[PDB]
Paper text:
In Escherichia coli (Eco), the essential primary σ factor, σ70, binds to RNAP to form the σ70-holoenzyme (Eσ70) that is capable of recognizing and initiating at promoters for most genes. Upon locating the promoter, Eσ70 melts a ~ 13 bp segment of DNA to form the open promoter complex (RPo) in which the DNA template strand (t-strand) is loaded into the RNAP active site, exposing the transcription start site. Although only half the length of DksA, TraR regulates Eco transcription by binding to the RNAP secondary channel and mimicking the combined effects of ppGpp and DksA.
Analysis of the rpsT P2-RPo cryo-EM data gave rise to two conformational classes that differed only in the disposition of the upstream promoter DNA and αCTDs. We focus here on the highest resolution class at a nominal resolution of 3.4 Å. The closed-clamp RNAP in the rpsT P2-RPo cryo-EM structure interacts with the promoter DNA in the same way as in RPo structures determined by X-ray crystallography or cryo-EM and is consistent with the DNase I footprint of the rpsT P2 RPo. This αCTD interacts with σ704 through an interface previously characterized through genetic analyses. The αCTDs are linked to the α-N-terminal domains (αNTDs) by ~15 residue flexible linkers. Density for the residues connecting the αCTD and αNTD was not observed in the cryo-EM map.
Numbering used by the authors:
A (entry chain J): 1333 to 1375
B (entry chain J): 692 to 789
C (entry chain L): 460 to 562
D (entry chain J): 100 to 148
E (entry chain I): 2 to 1342
F (entry chain J): 248 to 494
G (entry chain L): 90 to 100
The structure:
């Protein structure tokens, strides 16, 4: 309810979120994927 | 005193003799080797088997003033056993809830 | 249904025991299969959150499998049969292969 | 996936923004929770305009 | 001295103490409570008689007509037990009641009975308790566990200091009725007395007093004393009572008689007070400025105006003193309040109390009880006089009233089951006492404050609920009453009553499937004191206070047995000798010791009677006279033991077992185990699975003969006699002439119960242990049950163990079973499953049970006869078709390439769908029984008719034997009258027994009884004809089945599971452990004679767990099996029975002042050889629990055989052939086989069936369901870097409903890729949030 | 289909609870529309708007405002906020910790011949867990023409499926697991050894990590399907790579 | 006496 009124926006950038939403944890072997993705955005 | 006596009789009481009269080294008591290796059990549990066991406390925590003077090689009579049961169940009810 | 239940209550207070679904045919005016259907009209749906024991507090809804799915071996075998029929129909003539891919 | 709606005949207060411990409809109106519920239960009127 | 059926194998007994009280029938809790319930009570006590007397007579709303109880009956069951289990029905008894309706006269309140009307009416059924205390509810034998809740009454509790930070211990008296609203006073830290009702908001506790129309004057009267003050010629001299100055400081110079007793500021010493008592110092002049701190009792009103000078409960201000002296009052009385021994609490509560008048109290109670409703006088007063005083909606039934009176220290112990003014006012006076300091709070954990609801009481409560639910309708219907248009059956339903009692019995927290996979488990499940269930605390509410073994559990509840885990001590289990008091409180036997003698008059003491006396210890030396032998003996007075004088003990304990449950007195050497391992051992021993050859406990405790007999499994003779026929499926006892009744054919028939599935799928069996033509006696076993051996409870089997590390195949707790234990088939059990092939009715059509299944080769249907069901006897494997069932299918579809394939190969697609029943994967078995239930009106197939023909031959055979036996007794009585004057020895018994009838005798009833014989004989003929016809009806009639189910079939399989790695085993002392390798016989360590060792336990398990029992019991089992080897060696040479007799007599006399005394001198040579051939395997030794065999006697016994004293043998190593240094223990530990069988554990899921709402896999192994990969494993992968493993772990393997099929395709294409996607359960999450008012979407970029 | 009325076998339907809560909201809604069509007295439409506020309320979150409208059995209905909340909502139950394919469990036992990069894993569990791999291998080596033929081949358990299992097993880690998975070493990937029996033999130096007695403690063997996850189970999670506690 | 209750039946 608080995020709802406050219109809050979740940019994932965590381990719990990327486990919820079914994709690579940005921790071990997934860290490369996520850094390469951050450079693949805003190149 | 009972614990220290059982340990002084338990750890070195092997007396031997090499080309002569008598020497004494660390013992080969099976239960003692199992307690001295570090395999199972400490000196506490050995204490309870040989020496008198503990001063069992009531569920208050108010320690009783007559220890369970008998060990598990002799028999705990009905009173001593019923007093052991208090702490037995307190330990089980903790380690369930920890 | 209220007529069936009321006559069954009467038949149970009277006949001693619980009446059988043919005797309701005789106390009512039913072909005795209409009463079988009327009894078969299902009761309330068991709420799919009924607690069932057990094994870390699991409700019934954990136990109702999915039936409209198709098990992946049949999906694999449909793919395999697709590939087989393609490679087969390639063996025929082109016009006959087209008439059979169209028929 | 297809959702559907229901056209409520009368409006109806979304409970989360009315009963969450700091009441959002409450502190938005700067109005205590008790008076808002007295209005919502059709107990007491409320002024507007 | 011994039974002839006891001389088969008489067990040595190292019991030094004499038995004084036989172990009572271990199933008296269940049986005796229910026999209380369903039984004629010619008085208003317990029963259905109590329930009907309570609710009835139902009388209308002054409508000149009422309905009244008369008497009731329990008809016999439509189905006896076995038919009931086979058929699925509950095993019940119709409850016929004889209600009687009467209409009164017309317009005469004293109206005579106008119209009476009598007719018995069916109201519900009630499940009958079997012979054993197990009901049969839906063909599953159940047990209603007991219940241990708080006794009704008043309980003064502390809540000490934890409520508030000041540490000031509050107090509260709670009143718990057996039915109705609670009532709860208490103190808040300001010491204001607050009242709570049903645990709602509190109130000033004088609010209820005012609601009881007590004006402020007499409230102050009740709760306080009086300090009088006379205006005696100047400023209020004081009438002093001496003891009132107690604990105080005299802040004024209190003199008397021109004698200043006390100086100012001087605390009145006891000298002062006794001096004042001596001098009788009554009225003493006081400065009036001291009466500024008092409080007036009454209200003071002047005579002149009659106005209120000062209200009641008003602290005296000296201006009020002037204003009252001016009017001329003599007495100015106040209250007597000290800080210590007379507190001012009702006064302060009156201060905070807002109410004044009874209407205010009633309305205030009403508003707190019904907030929102405008309070009305009649509504408020009805609510109040219905909270605590209506005989209907409140009750402290006689247990409540007894505990209530005993707590308030009343003198009578019987009263009215509703509160009164006296009861509440005494609760407040006792709470105020216990606040001031005199008195002690109560503790809930005290088994005099903790009742037991059995089965009878709870079923009675549910039936009482049913009766109120029907009385509402009865009154509703006599409101609009007629006179002759309604009998007493149109008024009364049953489905309310029946629904209530049936939904208790079949669905309660306390009504569970019997844990029948053992005799010990059944008999320790019937005896279970559960603290859970309705009307009692839960797993989460409690709470370590009730979990803990309180010192009044001695002999009432077991210390060491309790189902460990989440509910420890919530499921305590009743001890050996504990009974239930008249009122439900637990009590135990104790021997009354007189002045010096230990009288053997056992004398039951409840939990609060025990705390007064001083009771001896069970193992107290007393010798030859009944006197003690020591000059001071251990006892226990009040939760504490201590040495006490010889002439100060009052009771001695009955036996040295009376503290443990029955589960924990089967453990040998319990006194040597830590309490913890005995908990685990007592708790595993009832999971031991009945094996294939019940052996015997080679080292026991004598509690096991009774655990087997007093259970139900063994078949005990009712009347002694001599056996006549012993099949493996019946025994037939030719009863003796003396025990036989006057006239009836006395022969008993025992239908043994052959292989029939239990609850836990094991196999409950019964074998005969008798021989043809062998004497029996009453109370004697005839048939071993499952896990019994000649009447001793044999749970597992004993086998030669050895405590040595064996190369790590017994590493942690693992066990290294040798191949001769799997090879002797000695742990091979028999498990019996029940498959079912329900044949339902679908809108497309009926499902048939055809053997013409589509898409299966002839070799699959070779086990199926023409009707579809498999042949009885045919060993199936996992996957066979047990019942071909085919369901109508319609119009599926055809994808492209499938129309192509079908057209290419000229096949016509099938019309009907295979839905057969097939044996579950992995399982073997031999189908021991099939049963077909055909709904009434569906044409029975071939096999249903074959099965009916079989069952009908069998029923007719059994009933025919019945008729033979009964006609026997008829002609017995006949010959009895003819032989008793008029007998013919040979002139009548040559010719057949049918010409027996037609003969006469001179004028007598012998002249007569011509009609006696003929009537009896043709009566039995006709009556048995109708009996057999009724049996042919119950066989042939169409069974009753659920709606829309044509016919049910129940293929019964009987798998024989051997022993293998994984099957958990466990001895009795809590040493458990999973088999980890099955060595060949050669590899086993072998002793010097070459005898291999059957099991190699681990040395390193004993010092750390501290169950030394397993070692002493290994040693004594070795001694016993040594005597077994010696006697076998005497029976191979077969020298003489003189040597055998003397040897076994030596081995029985051994001991040190044992009580077992056998003289084999009186044993006939026909009997000593039998005794020896039973003892060839090894002399069974007993060891009563806290009384066992001491170590010196164990060595002495081991010296009796030629075994070694240490018990430690030189074992060789069967592989390398070279001795293990430092000798090893070898003995026979008696080892159980817990049913954590590994082939009920292994499971694996490649791809299966998926959940419905969230497309993930299913539960465990019954739905063929994947494991749970919960949060903790997710963190354990995040802790590595496995972000690829974790991704396929929660996307492809689990949930991503497209990616998972496309993963299976890749995995078969030799390509290990994946496609991640969005799990379906997250997307369910979005639609569920988004179906709130919230909007949660995915920003796309 | 997220609030289904699926018919469980027996002619009995097994609805959800949201069907009840929506059915009630829509009934009170339609009734209020009627009570405004009849131009009703004020107290009745006020009562109906209160009942509708309660119904929409007990739908969006039940037990929050006043007492919970009880389900049919006797119980509070599980309204939507109870779908999401708690230990058993979607968030913790179905979304963080999923059930899993390719996984099983059976009793563990000792097996000391093992090297500590391997776990004795039974033939029957291994042939059950590795069926996609076996089917692909059989139709690759041509011993089974179609996928269905390979299926019946491994169901009949011929002599070639055990060779094919010994070959698609060879260098392929599996992930043993024990129930309370306290620290990150209670999931370690081993290399299977195909072993008769039905107990997962676990190496004896590994019990200190897993914290395992051998008196009944079961273990779960999951599988790394893909190629990257086999590499992470071999490099990262193997049993010879964490022989030092990360604490 | 308006508030103090969350029951619709009483209201
Ligand atoms: C003589 C006696 C009547 C007493 C007057 C009747 C009563 C019941 C009869 C027996 C039973 O059938 C059981 C048994 C069954 C065997 O299969 C066949 C023999 C047995 C011994 C029968 C023979 C005999 O006829 C019995 C003893
Ligand atoms: C595990 C549980 C026992 C626990 C004690 C038993 C008791 C009731 C059983 C379910 C019911 O039959 C309903 C349902 C019928 C479907 O058609 C097949 C699945 C369902 C869910 C069954 C599977 C399982 O066997 C259940 C859960
Ligand atoms: C509440 C009870 C908990 C177990 C105690 C639940 C768990 C599963 C429920 C049964 C299943 O639906 C199967 C079966 C379907 C029939 O067609 C209709 C009734 C049956 C007998 C159901 C009644 C009951 O509701 C059961 C036993
Ligand atoms: Mg373990």
């Amino acid at each position: 309810t608080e995020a709802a009124v406050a219109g809050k926006r979740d940019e994932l950038r965590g381990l719990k979120e990327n486990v919820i939403v079914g994709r690579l944890i940005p921790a071990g072997t997934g860290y490369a994927y996520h850094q390469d993705r951050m450079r693949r955005r805003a190149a | 005193r009972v614990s220290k006596a059982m340990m002084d009789n338990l750890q070195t009481e092997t007396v031997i003799n090499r080309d002569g009269q008598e020497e004494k080294q660390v013992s080969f008591n099976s239960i003692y080797m199992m307690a001295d290796s570090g395999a199972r059990g400490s000196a506490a549990q050995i204490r309870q088997l040989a020496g008198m066991r503990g001063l069992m406390a009531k569920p208050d925590g108010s320690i009783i003033e007559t220890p369970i003077t008998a060990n598990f090689r002799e028999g705990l009579n009905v009173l001593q056993y019923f007093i052991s049961t208090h702490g037995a169940r307190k330990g089980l009810a903790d380690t369930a809830l920890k | 249904i209220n007529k069936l239940n009321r006559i069954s209550r009467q038949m149970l207070q009277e006949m001693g025991r619980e009446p059988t679904p043919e005797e309701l045919a005789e106390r009512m005016l039913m072909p005795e299969d209409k009463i079988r259907k009327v009894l078969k009209i299902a009761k309330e749906p068991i709420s799919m959150e009924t607690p069932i024991g057990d094994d870390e507090d699991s409700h019934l809804g954990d136990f109702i499998e999915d039936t409209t799915l198709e098990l992946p071996l049949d999906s694999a075998t449909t793919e395999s049969l697709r590939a087989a029929t393609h490679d087969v129909l390639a063996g025929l003539t082109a016009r006959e292969a087209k008439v059979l891919r169209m028929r | 996936e297809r959702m559907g709606h229901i056209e409520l005949a009368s409006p109806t207060a979304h409970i989360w923004f009315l009963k969450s411990l700091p009441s959002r409809i409450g502190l938005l109106l700067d109005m205590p929770l008790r008076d808002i519920e007295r209005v919502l239960y059709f107990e007491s009127y409320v002024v507007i305009e | 001295v011994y039974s002839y059926t006891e001389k088969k194998r008489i067990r040595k007994d190292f019991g030094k103490r004499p038995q004084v009280l036989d172990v009572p029938y271990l199933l008296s809790i269940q049986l005796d409570s229910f026999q209380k319930f369903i039984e004629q009570d010619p008085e208003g006590q317990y029963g259905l008689e109590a329930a009907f007397r309570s609710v009835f007579p139902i009388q209308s709303y002054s409508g000149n007509s009422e309905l009244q109880y008369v008497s009731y009956r329990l008809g016999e069951p439509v189905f006896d037990v076995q038919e009931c289990q086979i058929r699925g029905v509950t095993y019940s008894a119709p409850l016929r009641v004889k209600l009687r309706l009467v209409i009164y006269e017309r317009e005469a309140p004293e109206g005579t009975v106008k119209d009476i009307k009598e007719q018995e009416v069916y109201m519900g059924e009630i499940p009958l308790m079997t012979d054993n205390g197990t009901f049969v509810i839906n063909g599953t034998e159940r047990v209603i566990v007991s219940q241990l809740h708080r006794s009704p009454g008043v309980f003064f509790d502390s809540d000490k200091g934890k409520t508030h930070s000041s540490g000031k211990v509050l107090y509260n008296a709670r009143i718990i009725p057996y039915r109705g609203s609670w009532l709860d006073f208490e103190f808040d830290p300001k010491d204001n007395l607050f009242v709570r009702i049903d645990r709602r908001r509190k109130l000033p506790a004088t609010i209820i007093l005012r609601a009881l129309n007590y004006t402020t004057e007499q409230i102050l009267d009740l709760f306080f004393e009086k300090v009088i003050f006379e205006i005696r010629d100047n400023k209020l001299q004081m009438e002093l009572v001496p003891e009132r100055l107690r604990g105080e400081t005299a802040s004024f110079d209190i003199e008397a008689n021109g004698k200043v007793y006390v100086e100012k500021g001087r605390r009145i010493t006891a000298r002062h007070i006794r001096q004042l008592e001596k001098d009788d110092v009554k009225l003493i002049e006081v400065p009036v400025e001291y009466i500024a701190g008092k409080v007036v009792a009454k209200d003071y009103i002047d005579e002149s105006t009659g106005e209120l000078i000062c209200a009641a409960n008003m602290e005296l201000s000296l201006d009020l003193l002037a204003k009252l002296s001016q009017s001329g009052h003599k007495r100015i009385e106040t209250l007597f309040t000290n800080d210590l021994d007379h507190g001012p609490y009702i006064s302060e509560t009156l201060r905070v109390d807002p109410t004044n008048d009874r209407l205010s109290a009633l309305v205030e109670i009403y508003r707190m009880m019904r907030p929102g409703e405008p309070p009305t006088r009649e509504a408020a007063e009805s609510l109040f006089e219905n909270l605590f005083f209506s005989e209907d909606r409140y009750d402290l039934s006689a247990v409540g009233r007894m505990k209530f009176n005993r707590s308030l220290l009343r003198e009578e112990i019987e009263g009215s089951g509703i509160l009164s003014k006296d009861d509440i006012i005494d609760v407040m006076k006792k709470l105020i006492d216990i606040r001031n300091g005199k008195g002690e709070v109560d503790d809930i954990d005290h088994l005099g404050n903790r009742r037991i609801r059995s089965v009878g009481e709870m079923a009675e409560n549910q039936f009482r609920v049913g009766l109120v639910r029907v009385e509402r309708a009865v009154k509703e219907r006599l409101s609009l009453g007629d006179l002759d248009t309604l009998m007493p059956q149109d008024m009364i339903n049953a489905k309310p009553i029946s629904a209530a009692v049936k939904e208790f019995f079949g669905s309660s927290q306390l009504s569970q499937f019997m844990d029948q996979n053992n005799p010990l488990s059944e008999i320790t499940h019937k005896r279970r004191i559960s603290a859970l269930g309705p009307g009692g605390l839960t797993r989460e509410r409690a709470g370590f206070e009730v979990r803990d073994v309180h010192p009044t559990h001695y002999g009432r509840v077991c210390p060491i047995e309790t189902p460990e885990g989440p509910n420890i001590g919530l499921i305590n289990s009743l001890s050996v000798y504990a009974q239930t008091n008249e009122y439900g409180f637990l009590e135990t036997p104790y021997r009354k010791v007189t002045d010096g003698v230990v009288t053997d008059e056992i004398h039951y003491l409840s939990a609060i009677e025990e705390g007064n006396y001083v009771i001896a210890q069970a193992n107290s030396n007393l010798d030859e006279e009944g006197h003690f032998v020591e000059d001071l003996v251990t006892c226990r007075s009040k939760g504490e033991s201590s040495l006490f004088s010889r002439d100060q003990v009052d009771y001695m304990d009955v036996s040295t077992q009376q503290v443990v449950s029955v589960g924990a007195s089967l453990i040998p050497f319990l006194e040597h185990d830590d309490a913890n391992r005995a908990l685990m051992g007592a708790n595993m021993q009832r999971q031991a699975v009945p094996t294939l050859r019940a052996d015997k406990p080679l080292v026991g405790t004598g509690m096991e003969r009774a655990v087997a007999v007093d259970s139900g499994v063994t078949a005990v003779a009712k009347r002694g006699g001599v056996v006549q026929y012993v099949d493996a499926s019946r025994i037939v006892i030719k009863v003796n002439e003396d025990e036989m009744y006057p006239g009836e054919a006395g022969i008993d028939i025992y239908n043994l119960t052959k292989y029939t599935r239990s609850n836990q799928n094991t196999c409950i069996n019964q074998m005969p242990c008798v021989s043809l033509g062998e004497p029996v006696e009453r109370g004697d076993v005839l048939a071993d049950g499952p896990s019994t051996d000649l009447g001793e409870l044999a749970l597992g089997q004993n086998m030669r163990v050895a405590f040595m590390p064996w190369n790590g195949y017994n590493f942690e707790d693992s066990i290294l079973v040798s191949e001769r234990v799997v090879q002797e088939d000695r742990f091979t059990t028999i498990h019996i499953q029940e498959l079912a092939c329900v044949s339902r009715d679908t809108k497309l059509g009926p499902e048939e049970i055809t053997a013409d299944i589509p898409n299966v080769g002839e070799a699959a249907l070779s086990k199926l006869d023409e009707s579809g069901i498999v042949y009885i006897g045919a060993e199936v494997t996992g996957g066979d078709i047990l019942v071909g069932k085919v369901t109508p299918k319609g119009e599926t579809q055809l994808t492209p390439e499938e129309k192509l394939l079908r057209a290419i190969f000229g096949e016509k697609a099938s019309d009907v769908k295979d839905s057969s029943l097939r044996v579950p994967n992995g399982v073997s078995g031999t189908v021991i029984d099939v049963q077909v239930f055909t709904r009434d009106g569906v044409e029975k197939d071939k096999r249903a008719l074959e099965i009916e023909e079989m069952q009908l031959k069998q029923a007719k055979k059994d009933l025919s034997e019945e008729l033979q036996i009964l006609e026997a007794g008829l002609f017995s009585r006949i010959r009895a009258v003819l032989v008793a004057g008029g007998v013919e020895a040979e002139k009548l018994d040559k010719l057949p027994r049918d010409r027996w009838l037609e003969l006469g005798l001179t004028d007598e009833e012998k002249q007569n009884q011509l009609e006696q014989l003929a009537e009896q004989y043709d009566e039995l003929k006709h009556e048995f004809e109708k009996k057999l016809e009724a049996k042919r009806r119950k066989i042939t009639q169409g069974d009753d089945l659920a709606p829309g189910v044509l016919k049910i079939v129940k293929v019964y399989l009987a798998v024989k599971r051997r022993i293998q790695p994984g099957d958990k085993m466990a001895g009795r002392h809590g040493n458990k452990g999973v088999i980890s390798k099955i060595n060949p016989i050669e590899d086993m360590p072998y002793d010097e004679n070459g005898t291999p060792v059957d099991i190699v336990l681990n040395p390193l398990g004993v010092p750390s767990r501290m169950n030394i029992g397993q070692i002493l019991e290994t040693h004594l089992g070795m001694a016993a099996k040594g005597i077994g080897d010696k006697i076998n060696a005497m029976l191979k040479q077969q020298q003489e029975v003189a040597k055998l007799r003397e040897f076994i007599q030596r081995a029985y006399d051994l001991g040190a002042d044992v009580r077992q005394k056998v003289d084999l001198s009186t044993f006939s040579d026909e009997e000593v050889m039998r005794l020896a051939e039973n003892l060839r395997k090894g002399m069974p030794i007993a060891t009563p629990v806290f009384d066992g065999a001491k170590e010196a006697e164990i060595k002495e016994l081991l010296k009796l055989g030629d075994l070694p004293t240490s018990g430690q043998i030189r074992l060789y190593d069967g592989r390398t052939g070279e001795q293990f240094e430092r000798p090893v223990t070898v003995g026979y530990m008696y080892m159980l086989k817990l049913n954590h069988l590994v082939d009920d554990k292994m499971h694996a899921r490649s791809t299966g069936s998926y959940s419905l709402v969230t497309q993930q896999p299913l539960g465990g192994k019954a739905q063929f369901g994947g494991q749970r990969f919960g949060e903790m494993e997710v963190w354990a992968l995040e802790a590595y870097g496995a972000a690829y493993t974790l991704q396929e772990m929660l996307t492809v393997k689990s949930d991503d409903v497209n990616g998972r099929t496309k993963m299976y395709k890749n995995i078969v294409d030799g390509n290990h890729q994946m496609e991640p996607g969005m799990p379906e359960s997250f997307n369910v999450l979005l639609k569920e949030i988004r179906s709130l008012g919230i909007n949660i979407e995915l920003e796309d970029e | 289909d997220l609030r289904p009325l699926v018919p469980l076998d027996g002619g009995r339907f097994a609805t959800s609870d949201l069907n009840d809560l929506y059915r009630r909201v829509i009934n009170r809604n339609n009734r209020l529309k009627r009570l405004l069509d009849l131009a009703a007295p004020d107290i009745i439409v006020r009562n109906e708007k209160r009942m509708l506020q309660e119904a929409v309320d007990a739908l969006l979150d039940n037990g929050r405002r006043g007492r919970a409208i009880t389900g049919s059995n006797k119980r509070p209905l599980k309204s939507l906020a109870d779908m999401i909340k708690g230990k058993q909502g979607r968030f913790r139950q179905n979304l963080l910790g999923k059930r899993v394919d390719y996984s099983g469990r059976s009793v563990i036992t000792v097996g000391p011949y093992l090297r500590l990069h391997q776990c004795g894993l039974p033939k029957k569990m291994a042939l059950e867990l590795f069926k996609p791999f076996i089917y692909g291998k059989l139709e690759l080596r041509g011993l089974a023409t179609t996928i269905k033929a390979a299926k019946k081949m491994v169901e009949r358990e011929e002599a070639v499926v055990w060779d094919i299992l010994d070959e698609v097993i060879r260098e392929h880690p599996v992930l043993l697991n024990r129930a309370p998975t306290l620290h990150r070493l209670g999931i370690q990937a081993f290399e299977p050894v195909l072993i008769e029996g039905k107990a997962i033999q676990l190496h004896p130096l590994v019990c200190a990590a897993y914290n395992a007695d051998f008196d009944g403690d079961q273990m779960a063997v999951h599988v790394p399907l893909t190629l990257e996850a086999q590499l992470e189970a071999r490099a990262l999670m193997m049993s010879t790579n964490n022989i030092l506690s990360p604490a | 006496e308006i508030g103090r209750t969350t029951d619709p039946v009483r209201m």
